[PDB]
Amino acid sequence: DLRNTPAKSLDKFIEDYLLPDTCFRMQINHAIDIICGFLKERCFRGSSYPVCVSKVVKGGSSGKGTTLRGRSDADLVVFLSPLTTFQDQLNRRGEFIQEIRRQLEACQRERAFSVKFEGNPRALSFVLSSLQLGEGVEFDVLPAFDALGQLTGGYKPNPQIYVKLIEECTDLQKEGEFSTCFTELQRDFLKQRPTKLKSLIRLVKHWYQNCKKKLGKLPPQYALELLTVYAWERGSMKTHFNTAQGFRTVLELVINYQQLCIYWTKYYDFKNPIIEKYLRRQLTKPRPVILDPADPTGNLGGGDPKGWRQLAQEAEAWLNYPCFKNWDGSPVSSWILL
RNA sequence: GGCUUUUGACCUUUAUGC
RNA sequence: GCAUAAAGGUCAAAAGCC
Numbered sequence: 001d002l003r004n005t006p007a008k009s010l011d012k013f014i015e016d017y018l019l020p021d022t023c024f025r026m027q028i029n030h031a032i033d034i035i036c037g038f039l040k041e042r043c044f045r046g047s048s049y050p051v052c053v054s055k056v057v058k059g060g061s062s063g064k065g066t067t068l069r070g071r072s073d074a075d076l077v078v079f080l081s082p083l084t085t086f087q088d089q090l091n092r093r094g095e096f097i098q099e100i101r102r103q104l105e106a107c108q109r110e111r112a113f114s115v116k117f118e119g120n121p122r123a124l125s126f127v128l129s130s131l132q133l134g135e136g137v138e139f140d141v142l143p144a145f146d147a148l149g150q151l152t153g154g155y156k157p158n159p160q161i162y163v164k165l166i167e168e169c170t171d172l173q174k175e176g177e178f179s180t181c182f183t184e185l186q187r188d189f190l191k192q193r194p195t196k197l198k199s200l201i202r203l204v205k206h207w208y209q210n211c212k213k214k215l216g217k218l219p220p221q222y223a224l225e226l227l228t229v230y231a232w233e234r235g236s237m238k239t240h241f242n243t244a245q246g247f248r249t250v251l252e253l254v255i256n257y258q259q260l261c262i263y264w265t266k267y268y269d270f271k272n273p274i275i276e277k278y279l280r281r282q283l284t285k286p287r288p289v290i291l292d293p294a295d296p297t298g299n300l301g302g303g304d305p306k307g308w309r310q311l312a313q314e315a316e317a318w319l320n321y322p323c324f325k326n327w328d329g330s331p332v333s334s335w336i337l338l
Numbered sequence: 339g340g341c342u343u344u345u346g347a348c349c350u351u352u353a354u355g356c
Numbered sequence: 357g358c359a360u361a362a363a364g365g366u367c368a369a370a371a372g373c374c
């Protein structure tokens with residue numbers, strides 16, 4: 001029980017309940033190998049029109065290394081050559097959702113594996129079960145347009161790519177509805193972080209699931225991850241820190257949701273006039289404001305004022321729980337941010 | 339400090355797709 | 357070169373146990 005776990009033993013809680021088991025990371029690497037192989041080697045050979053898979057991006061928990069044991073998805077982004085514009089991705093993702101299912105079910109007719117389902121939807125979702133899986137791994141398969149292309153790190157994406165995105169997102173009314181194209185940037189924001197930050201994120205995520213079971217409608221889990229990176233960057237910066245403090249710090253950010261204005265300039269900045277103007281309007285929006293580091297149009301925590309109202313009421317309640325109290329019963333401190 | 343596990347960086351391969 | 361999985365090597369971060 002996270003609620004009754006002493007603050008001192010939070011790292012032990014993460015170690016044997018949250019950190020991936022070797023069995024788990026073996027279960028996942030295999031399940032991915034099956035589908036990556038499937039997508040590349042059979043799914044689109046039989047071409048009424050040449051469909052080429054340029055990439056299959058491992059994203060979400062798996063890509064970042066923020067997986068909860070036995071509870072994390074496998075999120076695979078499929079970059080297709082026929083998808084050439086963002087609107088192409090919007091207009092044609094559904095065709096490809098339906099085709100991939102059709103191929104998977106054909107591969108289920110052959111006894112290669114089993115699969116359980118489940119423009120309009122964003123992803124194909126299913127539980128894959130092979131011989132060496134059985135209990136099955138859950139999947140989200142995301143067809144997407146390669147807006148970034150192949151790229152060497154240590155360099156920002158071309159700002160023109162973001163000019164296109166912003167113009168396209170506002171010509172239409174779907175801001176942040178193309179975050180998928182920038183999954184590699186979403187990933188590399190967390191993937192290279194110090195180890196214990198990912199651990200802390202795992203802890204925050206499990207706490208979040210325990211609120212989802214209780215409250216139902218809630219802000220995206222990604223928002224809470226970004227809050228944790230924010231809490232870490234502003235209140236610590238050490239590879240070695242106090243988990244109970246960081247956990248309390250994130251909870252208080254959630255409480256301070258009516259004041260949050262958070263953004264990073266890792267993949268975009270204000271040098272380009274069109275981006276500069278858009279970003280500045282974004283920081284103006286009602287609180288909280290949590291910009292996706294990979295997508296300036298992606299405002300997390302922008303959807304539900306009620307969702308944060310409830311999440312803050314649970315976080316407030318949690319501050320009295322044994323996990324924020326030391327041996328002597330004194331409260332754990334929270335970091336003072338920047 | 340010892341043992342182990344998790345998460346990464348870089349380097350070299352193998353299969354596969356582009 | 358990029359992407360997935362695997363194999364070898366070099367380095368590192370943290371955690372569990374002692």
Ligand SMILES: Nc1ncnc2c1ncn2[C@H]1C[C@H](O)[C@@H](COP(=O)(O)OP(=O)(O)OP(=O)(O)O)O1
Pocket residue numbers: 059060061062066067068071072073075140176179205220221222292298300
């Ligand atoms: N940018 C976003 N905006 C709104 N919702 C999002 C966004 N990104 C993800 N989600 C939601 C939709 C999905 O149904 C749900 C699952 O995301 P997911 O890919 O599984 O992230 P994750 O892998 O890091 O968390 P998990 O621990 O569940 O695996 O989160």
Ligand SMILES: [Mg+2]
Pocket residue numbers: 059060061062072073074075
């Ligand atoms: Mg996932």
Ligand SMILES: [Mg+2]
Pocket residue numbers: 060073075140
């Ligand atoms: Mg998912």
